[PDB]
Every structure is written in structure tokens, then in C-alpha cells.
Design an enzyme around this catalytic site. Structure first.
Site, PDB file in Angstrom:
ATOM      1  N   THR A 191       4.685 -22.225   6.805  1.00  0.00           N
ATOM      2  CA  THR A 191       5.748 -23.216   6.750  1.00  0.00           C
ATOM      3  C   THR A 191       5.774 -23.981   5.427  1.00  0.00           C
ATOM      4  OG1 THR A 191       5.552 -23.434   9.155  1.00  0.00           O
ATOM      5  CG2 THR A 191       6.810 -25.130   8.005  1.00  0.00           C
ATOM      6  N   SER A 192       4.634 -24.530   5.015  1.00  0.00           N
ATOM      7  CA  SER A 192       4.571 -25.247   3.741  1.00  0.00           C
ATOM      8  C   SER A 192       4.300 -24.285   2.582  1.00  0.00           C
ATOM      9  CB  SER A 192       3.461 -26.307   3.756  1.00  0.00           C
ATOM     10  OG  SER A 192       3.742 -27.369   4.651  1.00  0.00           O
ATOM     11  N   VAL A 200       1.569 -14.635  10.742  1.00  0.00           N
ATOM     12  CA  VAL A 200       2.623 -13.773  10.225  1.00  0.00           C
ATOM     13  C   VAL A 200       3.219 -14.460   8.994  1.00  0.00           C
ATOM     14  CG1 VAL A 200       4.226 -14.973  11.750  1.00  0.00           C
ATOM     15  CG2 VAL A 200       4.865 -12.736  10.813  1.00  0.00           C
ATOM     16  N   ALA A 217      10.123 -23.079  18.358  1.00  0.00           N
ATOM     17  CA  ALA A 217      11.342 -23.323  19.130  1.00  0.00           C
ATOM     18  C   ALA A 217      12.596 -23.598  18.297  1.00  0.00           C
ATOM     19  CB  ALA A 217      11.110 -24.458  20.122  1.00  0.00           C
ATOM     20  N   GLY A 218      12.459 -23.513  16.975  1.00  0.00           N
ATOM     21  CA  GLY A 218      13.586 -23.707  16.076  1.00  0.00           C
ATOM     22  C   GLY A 218      14.165 -25.098  15.863  1.00  0.00           C
ATOM     23  N   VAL A 219      13.649 -26.103  16.558  1.00  0.00           N
ATOM     24  CA  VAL A 219      14.188 -27.454  16.398  1.00  0.00           C
ATOM     25  C   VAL A 219      13.910 -28.013  14.999  1.00  0.00           C
ATOM     26  CG1 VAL A 219      14.245 -29.788  17.337  1.00  0.00           C
ATOM     27  CG2 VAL A 219      13.837 -27.840  18.848  1.00  0.00           C
ATOM     28  N   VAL A 271      -8.007 -14.295   3.609  1.00  0.00           N
ATOM     29  CA  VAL A 271      -8.745 -15.080   2.623  1.00  0.00           C
ATOM     30  C   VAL A 271     -10.007 -15.618   3.290  1.00  0.00           C
ATOM     31  CG1 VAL A 271      -8.683 -17.045   1.069  1.00  0.00           C
ATOM     32  CG2 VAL A 271      -6.621 -15.678   1.431  1.00  0.00           C
ATOM     33  N   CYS A 303      13.173 -33.678  25.488  1.00  0.00           N
ATOM     34  CA  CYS A 303      14.188 -32.640  25.388  1.00  0.00           C
ATOM     35  C   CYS A 303      14.094 -31.728  26.604  1.00  0.00           C
ATOM     36  CB  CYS A 303      13.988 -31.821  24.113  1.00  0.00           C
ATOM     37  SG  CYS A 303      12.454 -30.864  24.095  1.00  0.00           S
ATOM     38  N   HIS A 337       2.297 -29.193  18.363  1.00  0.00           N
ATOM     39  CA  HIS A 337       2.524 -29.855  17.087  1.00  0.00           C
ATOM     40  C   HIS A 337       1.257 -30.472  16.509  1.00  0.00           C
ATOM     41  CE1 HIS A 337       7.078 -30.442  18.193  1.00  0.00           C
ATOM     42  NE2 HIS A 337       6.697 -29.175  18.186  1.00  0.00           N
ATOM     43  N   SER A 390       9.829 -35.947  16.048  1.00  0.00           N
ATOM     44  CA  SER A 390       9.673 -35.283  17.338  1.00  0.00           C
ATOM     45  C   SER A 390       9.287 -33.823  17.107  1.00  0.00           C
ATOM     46  CB  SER A 390      10.982 -35.352  18.129  1.00  0.00           C
ATOM     47  OG  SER A 390      12.037 -34.723  17.423  1.00  0.00           O
TER      48      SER A 390
HETATM   49  C1  LIG Z   1       5.032 -22.245  20.045  1.00  0.00           C
HETATM   50  C2  LIG Z   1       5.350 -23.322  19.026  1.00  0.00           C
HETATM   51  C3  LIG Z   1       6.584 -23.983  19.075  1.00  0.00           C
HETATM   52  C4  LIG Z   1       6.930 -24.982  18.102  1.00  0.00           C
HETATM   53  N1  LIG Z   1       8.209 -25.515  18.148  1.00  0.00           N
HETATM   54  C5  LIG Z   1       8.624 -26.258  17.067  1.00  0.00           C
HETATM   55  C6  LIG Z   1      10.037 -26.583  16.884  1.00  0.00           C
HETATM   56  O1  LIG Z   1      10.909 -26.208  17.632  1.00  0.00           O
HETATM   57  N2  LIG Z   1      10.369 -27.366  15.776  1.00  0.00           N
HETATM   58  C7  LIG Z   1       9.368 -27.938  14.929  1.00  0.00           C
HETATM   59  O2  LIG Z   1       9.746 -28.750  14.125  1.00  0.00           O
HETATM   60  N3  LIG Z   1       8.088 -27.586  15.040  1.00  0.00           N
HETATM   61  C8  LIG Z   1       7.678 -26.746  16.043  1.00  0.00           C
HETATM   62  N4  LIG Z   1       6.384 -26.335  16.102  1.00  0.00           N
HETATM   63  C9  LIG Z   1       5.384 -26.878  15.140  1.00  0.00           C
HETATM   64  C10 LIG Z   1       5.600 -26.311  13.703  1.00  0.00           C
HETATM   65  O3  LIG Z   1       6.110 -24.970  13.817  1.00  0.00           O
HETATM   66  C11 LIG Z   1       4.252 -26.329  12.987  1.00  0.00           C
HETATM   67  O4  LIG Z   1       3.775 -27.679  12.997  1.00  0.00           O
HETATM   68  C12 LIG Z   1       4.409 -25.866  11.526  1.00  0.00           C
HETATM   69  O5  LIG Z   1       5.014 -24.567  11.458  1.00  0.00           O
HETATM   70  C13 LIG Z   1       3.034 -25.873  10.892  1.00  0.00           C
HETATM   71  O6  LIG Z   1       3.156 -25.526   9.378  1.00  0.00           O
HETATM   72  P1  LIG Z   1       1.918 -25.213   8.538  1.00  0.00           P
HETATM   73  O7  LIG Z   1       2.434 -24.766   7.183  1.00  0.00           O
HETATM   74  O8  LIG Z   1       0.979 -26.252   8.553  1.00  0.00           O
HETATM   75  O9  LIG Z   1       1.201 -24.087   9.173  1.00  0.00           O
HETATM   76  P2  LIG Z   1       1.565 -22.514   9.477  1.00  0.00           P
HETATM   77  O10 LIG Z   1       3.031 -22.271   9.362  1.00  0.00           O
HETATM   78  O11 LIG Z   1       0.923 -22.009  10.577  1.00  0.00           O
HETATM   79  O12 LIG Z   1       1.088 -21.699   8.295  1.00  0.00           O
HETATM   80  C14 LIG Z   1      -0.301 -21.365   7.959  1.00  0.00           C
HETATM   81  C15 LIG Z   1      -0.303 -19.904   7.548  1.00  0.00           C
HETATM   82  O13 LIG Z   1      -1.672 -19.574   7.040  1.00  0.00           O
HETATM   83  C16 LIG Z   1      -2.021 -18.238   7.532  1.00  0.00           C
HETATM   84  N5  LIG Z   1      -3.483 -18.240   7.412  1.00  0.00           N
HETATM   85  C17 LIG Z   1      -4.392 -19.003   8.128  1.00  0.00           C
HETATM   86  N6  LIG Z   1      -5.657 -18.779   7.766  1.00  0.00           N
HETATM   87  C18 LIG Z   1      -5.566 -17.840   6.769  1.00  0.00           C
HETATM   88  C19 LIG Z   1      -6.597 -17.163   5.957  1.00  0.00           C
HETATM   89  N7  LIG Z   1      -7.874 -17.411   6.069  1.00  0.00           N
HETATM   90  N8  LIG Z   1      -6.115 -16.245   5.032  1.00  0.00           N
HETATM   91  C20 LIG Z   1      -4.771 -15.966   4.891  1.00  0.00           C
HETATM   92  N9  LIG Z   1      -3.758 -16.539   5.596  1.00  0.00           N
HETATM   93  C21 LIG Z   1      -4.209 -17.462   6.527  1.00  0.00           C
HETATM   94  C22 LIG Z   1      -1.439 -18.201   8.909  1.00  0.00           C
HETATM   95  O14 LIG Z   1      -1.349 -16.885   9.411  1.00  0.00           O
HETATM   96  C23 LIG Z   1      -0.034 -18.854   8.691  1.00  0.00           C
HETATM   97  O15 LIG Z   1       0.993 -17.967   8.354  1.00  0.00           O
HETATM   98  C24 LIG Z   1       5.952 -25.339  17.084  1.00  0.00           C
HETATM   99  C25 LIG Z   1       4.675 -24.714  17.060  1.00  0.00           C
HETATM  100  C26 LIG Z   1       4.364 -23.685  17.987  1.00  0.00           C
HETATM  101  C27 LIG Z   1       3.021 -23.009  17.862  1.00  0.00           C
END
Ligand SMILES: Cc1cc2nc3c(=O)[nH]c(=O)nc-3n(C[C@H](O)[C@H](O)[C@H](O)COP(=O)(O)OP(=O)(O)OC[C@H]3O[C@@H](n4cnc5c(N)ncnc54)[C@H](O)[C@@H]3O)c2cc1C
Ligand SMILES: *[C@@H]1O[C@H](CO)[C@@H](O[C@@H]2O[C@H](CO)[C@@H](O[C@H]3O[C@H](CO[C@H]4O[C@H](CO)[C@@H](O)[C@H](O)[C@@H]4O)[C@@H](O)[C@H](O)[C@@H]3O)[C@H](O)[C@H]2NC(C)=O)[C@H](O[C@H]2O[C@@H](C)[C@@H](O)[C@@H](O)[C@@H]2O)[C@H]1NC(C)=O
Ligand SMILES: *[C@@H]1O[C@H](CO)[C@@H](O[C@@H]2O[C@H](CO)[C@@H](O)[C@H](O)[C@H]2NC(C)=O)[C@H](O[C@@H]2O[C@@H](C)[C@@H](O)[C@@H](O)[C@@H]2O)[C@H]1NC(C)=O
Ligand SMILES: *[C@@H]1O[C@H](CO)[C@@H](O)[C@H](O)[C@H]1NC(C)=O
Ligand SMILES: *[C@@H]1O[C@H](CO)[C@@H](O)[C@H](O)[C@H]1NC(C)=O
EC number: 4.1.2.10
Length: 521
Positions: free
Chosen positions: A36-37, A102, A111-113, A217, A328, A459, A496
Site C-alpha cells: 500500500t505505501s 501480493v 474491502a475497498g473503502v 527479503v 458500516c 486495521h 475509519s
Molecule cells: C481483509 C482486510 C480488509 C480491509 N479493508 C479495508 C478497507 O476497506 N479500506 C481501508 O482503508 N483499509 C482496509 N484494510 C486495511 C488496509 O488495507 C491496510 O491497513 C493497508 O493496506 C496496510 O498498508 P501497508 O503498506 O502498511 O501494508 P501492506 O499493504 O500489507 O504491504 C506490505 C507488503 O510487504 C510485503 N512483505 C512483507 N514482508 C516482506 C519481506 N520480508 N520481503 C518482501 N516483501 C515483504 C507484503 O507481502 C505486502 O505486499 C483491510 C485489511 C484487510 C486485511
């Protein structure tokens, strides 16, 4: 905002399987975790410098069902074979949960919100935010993957229930996290096509950005040049062959592996509590007491109703926002295979008809736990995590208030048509799972309901906090050329639904880094 279109896979031109990447590469920036980030961060940096993103999971194309709204439940139901996009885990509290695995990260299975962060949380965050840049970044993300949703019958019913139950005022269609009821944005477009963080890679420079998938990694490499500095990382491919990616002068390694993955990698790399690392014989690179500390997971409490008359499945778009809890409703089809993490455990009844899930998320949360390694050497082994739900009684008081509000929704004229029997108050519904206490004034009964029926809202965040492990520029204190940018950096949830904030954060920090490089040229 964006306009409905196919999921943009143009970035595939610069995507490679780790087996195909050089054994020893040199770049300006190496991003761990194409989530995501991580994706928007990588794309932003690639505008001027050579960037390599390393993601352990597959391309979204390997799992077609992560590309449509009707595939949401499907991904959660799929068995975890270690390669699937949905990785299952259970907190030490005993609550089932999941995280993405992935390219695109968890934004690919959520959930796409979509919502922008509460505009009042920036001041006390520990970061000196450039608000003009923040909004410019929200716009950049929104113009690529955020859409104004189609009207949906069940979401409209929910909107009428919230308004009848006093969740005021009505904001109409708005992306901002504000008290009251509104229809917010979604990363699912009007045809049900899922758009996610991976598409933000298309905003990068195709001659400077390289993405590696199936790249695990395992460790950050350091050196004293002259001071302690991150110089690269070691990652492994599907053949078991280890590769190395290094960063050049002024370049940096940025960890965006998520709330669970970032602290894990830091610990495995020798950055964390000295006594803890030593106990496991992990060489200490730098004593950092707060790595893996302050892990927060907002609790989700809910009520599932089974209407006597079928309702159609919908994507969440209507939000009922209160200061201490966010709510919601999600309507879905019946099933015999449980979506892991939806219900807190495997011993839960299955719906044999369409149902509606009314959910309530406690703000914060104030309660927190920590993350520890299960394996002192294998990054593919999920870390141990505990969230200590309701350990802070203020969270519990907020759950009670939240579930009482759900009780109000259940007592509205709007929800009457969905009862099986016309009974007084919240009674009369066919409930799937634990029902609300009948007496809406019985606080003790609500506390018991909150504690025994709790689940994760998915979350979770924290674990590598700004002010504890990182400084205001997201740098890991005491180490040069190393930053952390993802959901692990703050103790409280930004809204939220946090994806909007984390998507923005990626590019935001990317721009700060570019501005810094501009000044030092
Ligand atoms: C089922 C579900 C429903 C949700 N619904 C919503 C919603 O509707 N709207 C909303 O706002 N938020 C929602 N969220 C929360 C939101 O999606 C997450 O808070 C956000 O995507 C987290 O971003 P991030 O970049 O921190 O982590 P992530 O997007 O998880 O990214 C971390 C990435 O690092 C990779 N990674 C980890 N360790 C390693 C390693 N050692 N080497 C290489 N790659 C690695 C992972 O595979 C992943 O792709 C939901 C979460 C879940 C699980
Ligand atoms: C960054 O982006 C933020 C949004 O994500 C900006 O904010 C919003 O800024 C709007 C002005 O551009 C401001 O006014 C709008 O809303 C007014 C009232 O809104 C509320 O009440 C309405 C009825 O009472 C209701 O319908 C609505 O849903 C709201 O509940 C309205 O009177 C105006 O005509 C206008 O439409 C928004 O209220 C505001 N929203 C939020 C989330 O704060 C932000 O800009 C704002 O920054 C503040 C610090 C302040 O300077 C304010 O004046 C400014 O508008 C953007 N910041 C920057 C730096 O660009
Ligand atoms: C539950 O969360 C509360 C808010 O974070 C904690 O109270 C806050 O504690 C801060 C330092 O501990 C203090 O600076 C704040 O003023 C205070 N805020 C409030 C609303 O009081 C609370 O901590 C407990 O209660 C407070 C009042 C102190 O007595 C602390 O020593 C207690 O630990 C958290 N409770 C738990 C179970 O941790
Ligand atoms: C927004 O954040 C501020 C500051 O943390 C808080 O006081 C307020 O309750 C929040 N509003 C909502 C609706 O969450
Ligand atoms: C189907 O759902 C009903 C509630 O609507 C429940 O009573 C029944 O036991 C369920 N059937 C089975 C076999 O689970």
C-alpha cells in the site's frame, strides 16, 4: 477521482520474478515490500532515481479473484498454501486475522473503502506535515484509483438507518473522515473492478523503476561508512538462490513491509531490544528497545442479521462515524466455506441465506501489544503478535457505546422490514452468531458481549512508531540511509479506514526525499 476502467497492468513491462533479477544489483533506492505505501513511494522516487521494489508475493494476475469486488470473500476463503495473496495468522489473543502477500499489498485484498485521514490528527502525530503536499498527494492517488460509487440498495437502507439513529449530520458524498453519515469513495470502480496500490506503479518512470516479485527479503545489510549505515538487503528467490541489492551514495533502503513485516525484518536484521536479540543469538546492530512494540488492532464487534427476504450483495460505501467508534454494513451471499478472519474463530455458524453484517470499529485503539519472532532465522515464518483487546477500559466503554448505536439501528423503521418477527426493540431478527443483549441499558451485559464476541477489523498498525523508533522524517534513529514507510509508524488509526492515509504516506515521504536530494545536489 478516477473514471471506471480496466485494472492497469502497464507496469508489467518492468516487473520481474526474483529468479530473473541480477544476483548483485546497484540502485539509488531499494524498497522492501511492494504494498500500500511501498508502491506509491517507489513510483515517486523513480521519477528521478533508480529504484528496485522487492515483494515476496505474486503479481495480482496470478490470482484473478483479487481483481473484482465479488472476489473479496473468495480470497479470504482460500486455503493458505504459503503463496496465496491472503496470509492467515492468529493473534496470541486467539483472534483470527489476515495480511496481504501480493504486489499491491493488502490494498489488493481489502474491502475497498477509501477515506482521507481525520484532518485534526496531523498536529499531534510527531511529524511536521506539509498540508499542501498532503492534499496534493491525496489527489494524485484519488485521480488514479478512487471512485464515486454506484448507488446500492442495501447501502441506501443502511444510510437511512444511520440517519434515523442520529448519526448526524449527513455529508452526502464525501471522502473526508467526519462525524456523521456519508457515502465515501471506493477503490472498486462502478463495474466492480478492483483498483489498488500496484497501479500507482504506473505513475513511476518505466526506465528507472524495477519491481521484483516472489522476492523474500531476509535481512538488511549494514556497514560503518563511517557511521552505521544501511547498504542494501539480501533477498531469496523461488529456487532458494540469494540475491543482494545495494544502494549508492545518498541512496536509501526503505522498509514498507507492513505492521507485521517491518518489525520482523528489523529484528531479524539486528535492530531491536538488545537483551531480546542476544537471547536468540541475533547479532545486535543497534539497540532499539521499541522495535516490535506498540502494536495496535482496533476491535471489530458486530451483528449479523438474516433477512426473511433476500438482499443483494454490496460493497461498503456508507459510513456512520462517531467520535469514539466507526460503523458500516456489508451485505453478502451465503457460504459453507468460512472467509478466514471474518469471524474471530473457525467454530462459527455459516449463513445458508443472504445476510447483512453490521460492524463497529473502536477508535484508536488505546490498548496495545507487541510483536516477537517465532523463528529467529526464517522470515517466511509468521511473527507472534498480541493486541490485548480491551486491556484499556476506555476502549471497552467505546465498544459498549458503539454496540448500543448498532442496537439503535436495529430498532429503526428502516430495518423493520428485515426482522422475521415484529418484536419490540432489537428483537425479532434472525441472528447469525452472538446476539445483542435485549436490554439496551444493561451496560454490564454489553461489556460481556464486547469481550466475548470481538474480532479484528483488520486495521492493525504500529510496531515501529515515530518518536520511538523513527524520527519526524521516518528515518530509523541511529542508522543512516534507512527509513520505514507503511502502517507501522503510528499508534492510532487515521480514519475509519486507513488505506487512503497509507497510500498518501508512500508518495508523501517519497516527495520529501526528492526535495531533500534537490537541496543537497
Ligand atoms: C481483509 C482486510 C480488509 C480491509 N479493508 C479495508 C478497507 O476497506 N479500506 C481501508 O482503508 N483499509 C482496509 N484494510 C486495511 C488496509 O488495507 C491496510 O491497513 C493497508 O493496506 C496496510 O498498508 P501497508 O503498506 O502498511 O501494508 P501492506 O499493504 O500489507 O504491504 C506490505 C507488503 O510487504 C510485503 N512483505 C512483507 N514482508 C516482506 C519481506 N520480508 N520481503 C518482501 N516483501 C515483504 C507484503 O507481502 C505486502 O505486499 C483491510 C485489511 C484487510 C486485511
Ligand atoms: C486539505 O483538504 C481538506 C479536505 O480533505 C480541506 O478541508 C476542507 O476544506 C473545505 C474548504 O475548501 C471546507 O469547506 C467546505 O465545507 C464547508 C462546511 O463543511 C461541513 O459542513 C457542511 C454543512 O454545514 C457539510 O455539508 C459538510 O459535509 C461538512 O460537514 C462548507 O461551508 C464550504 O462551502 C466547503 O464546501 C471543509 O469543511 C474542509 N473539510 C475538512 C475535512 O476539514 C483542507 O482545507 C481546509 O483546511 C483547514 C485547515 C482550514 O484552513 C479550512 O479553511 C480549509 O478549507 C485542505 N487543506 C489545505 C492546506 O489545502
Ligand atoms: C488507557 O489509555 C489512557 C489514554 O491514553 C491512559 O491514560 C493516559 O495516560 C497517560 C500516561 O499514562 C497520561 O499522560 C494521560 O493524561 C492519561 N489520559 C487520561 C484520559 O487519563 C490510561 O492510563 C491509565 O490511566 C491514567 C489516568 C494513568 O493513571 C495511567 O498511569 C494509567 O496507566 C490507559 N489505561 C491503561 C490500562 O493503560
Ligand atoms: C478527529 O481527530 C481529533 C483529534 O484527534 C479528535 O478529537 C476527533 O474526535 C476526531 N474526529 C472523528 C470523527 O474521529
Ligand atoms: C440455515 O439457517 C437457519 C436460520 O435462517 C438455521 O436455523 C438453520 O439451522 C441453518 N441450516 C443449517 C443446516 O445450518
Amino acid at each position: 477521482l478516477a473514471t471506471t476502467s480496466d485494472h492497469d497492468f502497464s507496469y508489467l513491462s518492468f516487473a520481474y520474478d526474483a529468479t530473473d533479477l541480477e544476483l548483485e544489483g546497484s540502485y539509488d533506492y531499494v524498497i522492501v515490500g511492494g504494498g500500500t505505501s511501498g508502491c506509491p513511494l517507489a513510483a515517486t522516487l523513480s521519477e528521478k532515481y533508480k529504484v528496485l521494489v522487492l515483494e515476496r508475493g505474486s503479481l495480482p494476475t496470478a490470482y484473478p479473484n483479487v481483481l473484482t469486488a465479488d472476489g473479496f470473500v473468495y480470497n479470504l476463503q482460500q486455503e493458505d498454501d504459503g503463496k496465496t495473496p491472503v496470509e492467515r495468522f492468529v493473534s496470541e489473543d486467539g483472534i483470527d486475522n489476515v495480511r496481504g502477500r501480493v504486489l499491491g499489498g493488502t490494498s489488493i485484498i481489502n474491502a475497498g473503502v477509501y477515506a482521507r485521514a481525520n484532518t485534526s490528527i496531523y498536529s499531534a502525530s510527531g511529524v511536521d506535515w506539509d498540508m499542501d503536499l498532503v492534499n496534493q498527494t491525496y489527489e494524485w492517488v484519488e485521480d488514479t484509483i478512487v471512485y464515486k460509487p454506484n448507488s446500492q440498495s442495501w447501502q441506501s437502507v443502511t444510510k437511512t438507518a444511520f440517519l434515523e439513529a442520529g448519526v448526524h449530520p449527513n455529508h452526502g458524498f464525501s471522502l473526508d473522515h467526519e462525524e456523521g453519515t456519508r457515502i465515501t469513495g471506493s477503490t472498486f470502480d462502478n463495474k466492480g473492478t478492483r483498483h489498488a496500490a500496484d497501479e500507482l506503479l504506473n505513475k513511476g518512470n518505466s526506465n528507472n523503476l524495477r519491481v521484483g516479485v516472489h522476492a523474500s527479503v531476509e535481512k538488511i545489510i549494514f556497514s560503518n561508512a563511517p557511521g552505521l549505515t544501511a547498504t542494501g538487503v539480501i533477498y531469496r528467490d523461488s529456487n532458494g538462490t540469494p540475491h543482494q541489492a545495494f544502494v549508492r551514495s545518498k541512496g536509501e533502503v526503505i522498509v514498507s513491509a507492513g505492521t507485521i513485516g517491518t518489525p520482523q525484518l528489523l529484528l531479524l536484521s539486528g535492530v531491536g531490544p538488545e537483551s531480546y536479540l542476544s537471547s536468540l543469538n541475533i547479532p545486535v546492530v543497534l539497540s532499539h528497545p521499541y522495535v516490535g512494540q506498540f502494536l495496535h488492532d482496533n476491535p471489530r464487534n458486530f451483528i449479523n442479521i438474516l433477512p426473511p427476504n433476500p438482499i443483494e450483495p454490496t460493497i461498503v460505501t456508507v459510513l456512520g462515524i462517531s467520535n469514539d467508534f466507526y460503523q458500516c454494513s456489508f451485505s453478502s451471499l451465503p457460504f459453507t466455506t468460512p472467509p478466514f478472519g471474518f469471524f474471530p474463530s473457525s467454530s462459527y455458524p455459516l449463513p445458508n441465506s443472504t445476510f447483512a453484517h453490521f460492524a463497529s470499529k473502536v477508535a484508536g485503539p488505546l490498548s496495545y501489544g507487541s510483536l516477537t519472532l517465532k523463528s529467529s532465522s526464517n522470515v517466511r515464518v509468521s511473527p507472534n503478535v498480541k493486541f490485548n483487546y480491551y486491556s484499556n477500559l476506555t476502549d471497552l466503554s467505546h465498544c459498549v457505546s458503539g454496540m448500543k448505536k448498532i442496537g439503535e439501528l436495529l430498532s429503526t423503521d428502516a430495518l423493520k422490514p428485515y426482522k422475521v418477527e415484529d418484536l419490540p426493540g432489537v428483537e425479532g431478527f434472525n441472528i447469525l452468531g452472538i446476539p445483542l443483549p435485549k436490554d439496551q441499558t444493561d451496560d454490564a451485559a454489553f461489556e460481556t458481549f464486547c469481550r466475548e464476541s470481538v474480532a479484528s477489523y483488520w486495521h492493525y498498525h504500529g510496531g515501529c512508531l515515530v518518536g520511538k523508533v523513527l524520527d519526524g522524517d521516518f528515518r530509523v534513529t541511529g542508522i543512516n540511509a534507512l527509513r520505514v514507510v507503511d502502517g507501522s509508524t503510528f499508534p492510532y488509526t487515521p480514519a475509519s479506514h486507513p488505506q487512503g492515509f497509507y497510500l498518501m504516506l508512500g508518495r508523501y515521504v517519497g516527495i520529501k526525499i526528492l526535495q531533500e536530494r534537490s537541496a543537497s545536489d
